[PDB]
Design a protein around this ligand. Sequence first.
Ligand SMILES: Nc1nc2c(ncn2[C@@H]2O[C@H](COP(=O)(O)OP(=O)(O)CP(=O)(O)O)[C@@H](O)[C@H]2O)c(=O)[nH]1
Ligand SMILES: [Mg+2]
Ligand SMILES: [Mg+2]
Ligand SMILES: [Mg+2]
Ligand SMILES: [Mg+2]
Ligand SMILES: [Mg+2]
Ligand SMILES: [Mg+2]
Ligand SMILES: [Mg+2]
Ligand SMILES: [Mg+2]
Ligand SMILES: [Mg+2]
Ligand SMILES: [Mg+2]
Ligand SMILES: [Mg+2]
Length: 132
Amino acid sequence: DTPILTFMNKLDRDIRDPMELLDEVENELKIGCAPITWPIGCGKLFKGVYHLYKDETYLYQSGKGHTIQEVRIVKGLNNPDLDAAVGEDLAQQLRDELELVKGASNEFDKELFLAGEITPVFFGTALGNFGV
RNA sequence: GUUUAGAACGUCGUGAGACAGUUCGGUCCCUAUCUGCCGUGGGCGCUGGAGAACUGAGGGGGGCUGCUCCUAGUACGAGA
Ligand SMILES: Nc1nc2c(ncn2[C@@H]2O[C@H](COP(=O)(O)OP(=O)(O)CP(=O)(O)O)[C@@H](O)[C@H]2O)c(=O)[nH]1
Ligand SMILES: [Mg+2]
Ligand SMILES: [Mg+2]
Ligand SMILES: [Mg+2]
Ligand SMILES: [Mg+2]
Ligand SMILES: [Mg+2]
Ligand SMILES: [Mg+2]
Ligand SMILES: [Mg+2]
Ligand SMILES: [Mg+2]
Ligand SMILES: [Mg+2]
Ligand SMILES: [Mg+2]
Ligand SMILES: [Mg+2]
């Protein structure tokens, strides 16, 4: 019963719709999950990640995966600067995706983590040096 | 290179000589009349004469392409 905290690697290339991916994890291999970061669209249009507990959002520039890049933050969910920085292409999907996952999934508590019933995730991309 | 006159080899003929056999040497002229083409002028015309600036029927010129980087090690692919 060691603790475990997954990390959805290889987010640059077209992924399965992440929500069923989370459900497939927390039911096929019974561990139960609770995300910490949610990605703003995937593939050719993966733009940034939205932290859930820092309540901000980051941005990702491709082809920089050989040095630590500087973070650009658009802090605040409903801040219209985001909808002008990602676009209603994905923001309007982000809002209801969050409000569909927060209600229907679990939250994070360290003590339950240190027994193996809740594992937080962290989305990101290894070649993009982004989620690490 | 072939295709004259000199000379030697192999082969053929008694011989002069001969061989799409080989080998060394060996005189290549022309001031452009007409058509054609490239440039550049004189005459007359265009409806009184002269100095400039245009329009544009038409015609010609030009049109080649390699490596590198971003998108991206993405789509595709079990991987390479
Ligand atoms: N775009 C992208 N590709 C990735 C990323 N991480 C891994 N890959 C893919 O996987 C390759 C590297 O695989 P690697 O992480 O070394 O695998 P491994 O687990 O060591 C292989 P083994 O199971 O034998 O130990 C890359 O060349 C690429 O094709 C990532 O963050 N982004
Ligand atoms: Mg001759
Ligand atoms: Mg002779
Ligand atoms: Mg001589
Ligand atoms: Mg003469
Ligand atoms: Mg004639
Ligand atoms: Mg002539
Ligand atoms: Mg002429
Ligand atoms: Mg002239
Ligand atoms: Mg004239
Ligand atoms: Mg014309
Ligand atoms: Mg022409």
